[PDB]
Structures are given as C-alpha cells and as structure tokens.
Design a protein around this ligand. Structure first.
Ligand SMILES: CNC(=O)c1cc(Oc2ccc(NC(=O)Nc3cccc(C(F)(F)F)c3)cc2)ccn1
Length: 262
C-alpha cells in the first residue's frame, strides 16, 4: 500500500489541503465523485469511503493512472495518500459531460463529421490502452465512460462503476480469459449508438440485451444508409469470435480515412 507511495512519481503526490471541494458529481461503491479545484485546474476528485477489498482496488486505479499519457485518455492530476480516510484521486474535469448525456438526455442531433470525430477519438484512446507495454483491457467501455470536451473531441475514462470437447459453451467461456478483443465488441456497440443516436436494444433492460447478444445472436440493425467502411467495422467488430474482431489500428485508420471524405 505504501509500496504505491514509493513507486509513484513525486509531482503526483498530493496533500488533502491542496484540494478544494465544490460539488458532488456522482456516487459509487468506492465513494463519492466531486468537482473541485486543484493546482489552478478545475478537477474531478474520486474520493474513497479502509478494508482489504476496496484498498486493492485503490492501488490498482492509481497504478493505472500514473501510466496514462494520451490526449484521448483521461488525465491524472495526482493522488492523496496520507491516511485511508484521506485517499483520493484527482483528474482533469472534462466539462462537456458524457457521450450518454449528449445522445440520450440532451438529445442533440449531430453532423456526420461530429459523429466521426468522437468515434476516432475513442478509437485512438483505446489503441493507446491496448498498446501499453502491459496492455489494458478497459472491460467497461460504453457511452457513460466516454467524456466530451465543449469542442466535441472525446476522452476515454472509467467511472469505476475437464475435457473441453464435451463442454457447454457457457462453461468453456468461464475457463477462457477474455482479451482486449472484448473492448472491440464494446466499441462497435458505441459506434452504432453514435451513428443512430440510439441506445443499443433500447427496448430492453440490460441483462435481456446481453443474453440476446450472447444466446440468441441478435445485434443492432445495420441500416443500408450506414457508410461502407463503417458498417464493415460494425459487423466484424461485434462478431462472436473474438479473434475475428479488428485491432484499433485498423478502426482508427479506416475511420480517419472517412473524415477526409466528409
Ligand atoms: C462533466 N465532467 C464530469 O462529470 C467528469 C467526471 C469525471 O470523473 C472521473 C473521475 C475519475 C475517473 N478515473 C478514471 O477514469 N480512472 C481510470 C481507471 C482505469 C482505467 C481508466 C482508463 F482511462 F484507462 F479507461 C481510467 C473517471 C472519471 C472526470 C471528468 N469529468
């Protein structure tokens, strides 16, 4: 736990007094999320409620955050590490809100170019996460975990919320580590959500949607209106065979090629 304190770079250490708290932004099992001011920046402070389960998770997040340096991934400001009562995580505050709010709450209509910029930014950030010397599976990529600047660029974050031959496929899957290709499945649903401005399987509650995708092989409808290079990314992206899904390098390259024509 203090192993983190030694391992963390100097400028990232923060004192609890150096952090000004203004409003609450969200709640979790980890604690509350504040909007505040710290180091002359408007920041977001992830504050924690000191028993083993939650602490192992605290070090994990900090360990992840001091490694991230990319314009399409959330920025770490630093963390407070004096006592467990004062454990906190400080990041940039991206003021434009979540992609979810933009699409489903504010219900805004977007330009195709507007849509493609967000998509590419998410793709760029994920390629970044997947090309770390120790690659990171996001595991929870969705429109709530994608934040937007006021200028419409976006940032990828995480709110912290036998013999095989006769085995059942749902039993086989629990013996198989999921890989980064799991993030490609998730991205593709988000990309469909951007293009259509619709929540995936909007008519269903989440667990029903998940089983329809897994057990009954339903995907969202790919209309004909959807651009040739994109719709291809979708089909392959949400393929049931993980290996059959593209790398982000390809998504980025193809989505960027589209920007040049819009
Ligand atoms: C209107 N703006 C906001 O309400 C708002 C809220 C806001 O809260 C947050 C605070 C901290 C985090 N911490 C985070 O992503 N940690 C992380 C952990 C593992 C992996 C990743 C990765 F990036 F790799 F996915 C990230 C997120 C959100 C931030 C900005 N703005």
């Amino acid at each position: 736990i203090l192993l983190l304190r030694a391992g963390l770079p100097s400028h990232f250490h923060l004192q609890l007094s150096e952090i000004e708290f203004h409003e609450i932004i969200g709640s979790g099992s980890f604690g509350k999320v504040y909007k505040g001011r710290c180091r002359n920046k408007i920041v977001a402070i992830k504050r924690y409620r000191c028993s083993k389960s939650d602490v192992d998770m605290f070090c994990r997040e900090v360990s992840i955050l001091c490694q991230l340096n990319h314009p399409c991934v959330i920025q770490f400001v630093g963390a407070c590490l004096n006592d467990p009562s004062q454990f906190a995580i400080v990041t940039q505050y991206i003021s434009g809100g979540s992609l979810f709010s933009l699409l489903h709450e504010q219900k805004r209509i977007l330009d195709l170019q507007s849509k493609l910029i967000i998509a590419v930014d998410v793709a760029k950030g994920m390629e970044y996460l997947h090309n770390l010397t120790q690659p990171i599976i996001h595991r929870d990529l969705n429109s709530h975990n994608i934040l937007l600047y006021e200028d419409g660029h976006a940032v990828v974050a995480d709110f912290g919320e036998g013999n095989l031959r006769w085995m059942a496929p749902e039993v086989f899957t629990q013996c198989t580590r999921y890989t980064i290709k799991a993030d490609v499945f998730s991205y593709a649903l988000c990309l469909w959500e951007i293009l259509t401005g619709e929540i995936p399987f909007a008519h269903l509650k989440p667990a029903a949607a998940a089983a329809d995708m897994a057990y009954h092989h339903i995907r969202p409808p790919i209309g004909y209106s959807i651009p040739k290079p994109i719709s291809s990314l979708l089909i392959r992206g949400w393929n049931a065979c993980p290996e059959g899904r593209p790398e982000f390098s390809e998504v980025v390259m193809k989505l960027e090629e589209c920007l040049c024509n819009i």
